[PDB]
Amino acid sequence: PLESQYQVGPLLGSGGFGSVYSGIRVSDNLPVAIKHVEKDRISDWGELPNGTRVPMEVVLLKKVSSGFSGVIRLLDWFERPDSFVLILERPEPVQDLFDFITERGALQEELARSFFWQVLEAVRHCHNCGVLHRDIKDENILIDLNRGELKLIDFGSGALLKDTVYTDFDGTRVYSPPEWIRYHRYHGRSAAVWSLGILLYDMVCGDIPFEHDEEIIRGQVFFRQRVSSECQHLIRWCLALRPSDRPTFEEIQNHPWMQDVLLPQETAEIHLH
Numbered sequence: 001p002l003e004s005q006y007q008v009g010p011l012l013g014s015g016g017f018g019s020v021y022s023g024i025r026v027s028d029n030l031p032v033a034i035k036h037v038e039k040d041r042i043s044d045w046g047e048l049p050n051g052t053r054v055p056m057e058v059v060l061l062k063k064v065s066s067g068f069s070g071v072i073r074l075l076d077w078f079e080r081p082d083s084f085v086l087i088l089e090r091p092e093p094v095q096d097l098f099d100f101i102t103e104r105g106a107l108q109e110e111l112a113r114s115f116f117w118q119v120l121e122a123v124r125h126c127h128n129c130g131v132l133h134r135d136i137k138d139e140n141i142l143i144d145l146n147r148g149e150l151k152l153i154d155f156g157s158g159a160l161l162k163d164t165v166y167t168d169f170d171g172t173r174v175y176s177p178p179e180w181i182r183y184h185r186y187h188g189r190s191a192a193v194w195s196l197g198i199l200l201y202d203m204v205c206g207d208i209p210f211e212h213d214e215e216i217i218r219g220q221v222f223f224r225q226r227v228s229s230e231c232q233h234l235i236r237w238c239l240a241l242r243p244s245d246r247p248t249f250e251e252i253q254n255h256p257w258m259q260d261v262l263l264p265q266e267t268a269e270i271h272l273h
């Protein structure tokens with residue numbers, strides 16, 4: 001089932017998420033990624049309409065893999081005795097945003113605007129399909145280097161979107177909002193907007209703004225790089241201490257700093273090729 005249909009290549013990476021290998025679908029040589037997760041290392045489980053116990057990530061990816069998007073597509077999945085295996089699409093050539101930022105340092109605002117806009121479109125798509133990622137960060141974003149298109153990855157910390165409080169969190173701490181640090185309580189959209197503020201700061205400054213819990217709680221933003229006043233304003237708004245003071249996704253995309261975004265292909269020509 002798995003062995004015959006996919007030819008396995010080298011390990012791309014491993015960590016809390018499991019182990020991800022490059023691969024190729026044997027039938028048509030389609031590039032793929034193959035994610036293995038041990039059953040013991042999965043805490044968040046869900047059920048398919050069919051009535052089958054699977055990892056939540058499988059439920060979430062099926063809900064968002066409908067149509068095209070800036071979300072990594074689940075092509076197939078398999079259950080094994082002690083693990084689940086997910087077959088994901090693989091752009092070629094590709095680089096993850098963390099490595100891209102590390103190599104360039106801070107991104108030019110024009111580039112950060114295009115990237116951030118695409119992340120916003122992808123996150124909006126997730127929320128429309130009832131899915132909350134809960135771990136938005138540069139490490140969970142891939143760049144299709146030829147087309148200039150960003151793709152969200154790793155829904156292993158995610159959940160079904162709801163309007164009530166979340167009391168569990170498995171995402172990355174330094175991207176987590178002050179309300180989680182202080183009260184172990186947050187709401188979906190406003191916590192997501194906090195992580196987007198951290199991401200945007202990361203793009204235009206070349207690193208995250210807060211390291212320790214006390215910096216997150218204080219919420220004072222210091223700019224280490226030259227950043228436009230409009231971009232600083234949007235960042236500070238996303239990082240409002242009070243969740244209800246943070247912008248909606250609509251307010252983010254109507255912010256003056258977000259106007260006249262480049263198309264992804266233009267973005268590649270000017271900034272990537």
Ligand SMILES: C[C@H]1NC(=O)c2cc(-c3cccc4c(=O)n(C5(C)CC5)c(NC5(C)CC5)nc34)[nH]c21
Nearest residue numbers: 012013017020033088089090094095096153154155
């Ligand atoms: C972060 C990890 N967790 C996931 O769910 C997932 C999916 C991928 C993944 C999917 C498709 C393509 C790539 C890919 O090309 N790469 C590269 C080799 C371009 C960086 C990587 N690198 C990572 C983030 C694993 C270390 N992951 C992919 N990586 C992860």
